[PDB]
Amino acid sequence: KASSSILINEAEPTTNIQIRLADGGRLVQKFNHSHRISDIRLFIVDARPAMAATSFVLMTTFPNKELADENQTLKEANLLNAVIVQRLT
Numbered sequence: 001k002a003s004s005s006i007l008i009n010e011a012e013p014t015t016n017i018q019i020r021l022a023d024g025g026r027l028v029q030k031f032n033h034s035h036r037i038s039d040i041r042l043f044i045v046d047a048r049p050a051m052a053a054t055s056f057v058l059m060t061t062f063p064n065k066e067l068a069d070e071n072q073t074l075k076e077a078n079l080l081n082a083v084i085v086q087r088l089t
Contacts, residue, residue: 002046002051003039016073017058019086025050033080037069051088059085 008014008030015022016030058067
C-alpha cells in the first residue's frame with residue numbers, strides 16, 4: 001500500500017516537505033532522514049487523482065537547490081533541509 005500515512009514522529013528530527021497547487025490546492029508530505037524520496041512515488045500515487053497529468057517540481061529554499069535523492073536514507077542526499085518546498089503547476 002502506498003505509504004500515504006508518512007507522518008513525522010514527535011520524538012525524532014525528520015524532514016517534512018509541503019506541496020501547494022497553483023489552483024488553490026495544498027498537501028503536506030513528511031519524510032524521514034533515513035527514508036528514500038522514492039517513497040514519495042507511492043505516496044503521490046495514493047493521492048494522485050488530479051496530479052494524473054500535471055507538470056510539477058520539488059525544490060528546497062534555504063540552499064536554493066533542486067531536490068536530489070538516490071534510494072537509501074534521505075539524509076544521504078546531503079541535502080537534508082528538514083523543510084522543503086514543492087510546487088504544483
